[PDB]
Amino acid sequence: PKHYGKTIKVYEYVPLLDDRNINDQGIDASGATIVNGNLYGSSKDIGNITSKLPLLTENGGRVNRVGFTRIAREGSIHKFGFFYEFTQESIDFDSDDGLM
């Protein structure tokens, strides 16, 4: 549209289990704050996944908290053009009447 500059932006929402999901909402299964809030992210390692499984006891509590993330994309437009010039004689006296 008009009056919005030359750029368009859009959001992309990252999945929960993704390495791009970098956030500070993480609380592990024992209730301790952890550096990552995406559980095991994109990991496919069995050992890594096991140590980060959201296990839950019969007493519940503040355990296994997660966070989320999103990304923004953008692009812009540009301007182009060219021209050429001629005289009246270059049209009238030329052999080819279809020159233009």
Binding site: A29, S30, G31, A32, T33, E58, N59, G61, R62, V63
Partner: protein, 139 residues
């Protein structure tokens, strides 16, 4: 193991430490608890232990004790910082019974996670005879 808990009044950060651990950041000692629990090892955890310890300390001054409603009970603003040794967990338990025949080779394997590395393994054998106790398998 016994886990010592330190609390920082200004940052609402509860630090869990080994029994011999210590801090020098102004945090005060609020108590200690057994992890895993001796009577309910798999029904509670460090969060419940810290909550129980904090319930009996004053919100005005964590060094002093207090009763409800003048105690620390709002866990939503409490950050639990884990610095004690990770709990020792038996990842791959052995098969309760193995059946075979004479002349066959038998293999036992165990996977253990947590604890303070390095881990050490010691196997023992107990014969089926009456009154036989566990004896170390000579390495």
């Amino acid at each position: 193991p016994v886990l010592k808990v330190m609390f920082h009044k200004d940052t609402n950060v509860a630090t869990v430490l080994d029994a011999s651990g210590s801090l020098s950041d102004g945090s005060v000692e609020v108590g200690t608890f057994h992890h895993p629990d001796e009577t309910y090892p798999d029904s509670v955890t460090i969060y419940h232990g810290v909550r129980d310890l904090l319930y009996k300390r004053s919100a005005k001054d964590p060094s002093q004790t207090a009763s409800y409603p003048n105690n620390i009970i709002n866990m939503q603003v409490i950050s639990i910082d884990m610095k004690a040794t990770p709990r020792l967990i038996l990842g791959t338990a052995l098969p309760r019974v193995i059946s075979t025949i004479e002349g066959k080779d038998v293999t036992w394997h165990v996977d253990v996670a947590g604890g303070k590395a390095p881990l050490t393994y010691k196997w023992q054998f107990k014969a089926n005879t009456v009154g036989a106790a566990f004896a170390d398998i000579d390495s």
